[PDB]
Amino acid sequence: MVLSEGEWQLVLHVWAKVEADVAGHGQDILIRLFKSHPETLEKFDRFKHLKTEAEMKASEDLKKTGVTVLTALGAILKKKGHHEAELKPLAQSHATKHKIPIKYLEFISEAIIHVLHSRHPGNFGADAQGAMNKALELFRKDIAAKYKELGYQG
Numbered sequence: 001m002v003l004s005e006g007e008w009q010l011v012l013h014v015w016a017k018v019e020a021d022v023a024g025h026g027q028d029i030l031i032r033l034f035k036s037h038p039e040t041l042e043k044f045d046r047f048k049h050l051k052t053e054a055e056m057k058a059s060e061d062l063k064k065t066g067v068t069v070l071t072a073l074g075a076i077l078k079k080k081g082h083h084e085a086e087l088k089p090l091a092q093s094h095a096t097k098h099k100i101p102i103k104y105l106e107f108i109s110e111a112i113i114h115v116l117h118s119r120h121p122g123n124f125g126a127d128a129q130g131a132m133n134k135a136l137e138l139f140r141k142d143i144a145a146k147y148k149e150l151g152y153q154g
């Protein structure tokens, strides 16, 4: 697929707002994901054991991870589709080391869209959410194809 420049614009406009507070968005998004789909918390051996949302809000490890996840996702979005190189190393560690099914990448995409919507309603109307969804679907389709070349297609 291919996003038009206008869609990339909408995606990068709201992402510039996320970048004013990367660690807070990172926490929100992972917590939203773990609440919604608790099995996804088991993939994180570092803080699998956190039982409540309050614990998750107080975990420094969870917050550092969220910043790593969002920074890598922002570097991929900023490429505007030309992300081949950024994807490689990513697809390799998630398919071979962490083993994250494509399905989980769908759950976190849902979580990202929920948080942008709650935090940025004025910059995240229908057209911008559609564009963000296209950009995340694109990312998932390219990573799934890479999983396949790597022997995982999960």
Ligand code: HEM
Pocket (backbone or CB within 6 Å): 040, 041, 043, 044, 045, 046, 065, 068, 069, 070, 072, 073, 089, 090, 093, 094, 098, 100, 104, 105, 108
């Ligand atoms: C927008 C989606 C995602 C991006 C861009 C992202 C990016 C990353 C990055 C850059 C790292 C560090 C380097 C490496 O290990 O490759 C990482 C580690 C990790 N990711 Fe992902 N990730 C995404 C989704 C997920 C999801 C949905 C899960 C789990 C359900 C997940 C599980 C992990 C785990 C377990 C690690 C190790 C954390 C630690 O021990 O350091 N990731 N991810």
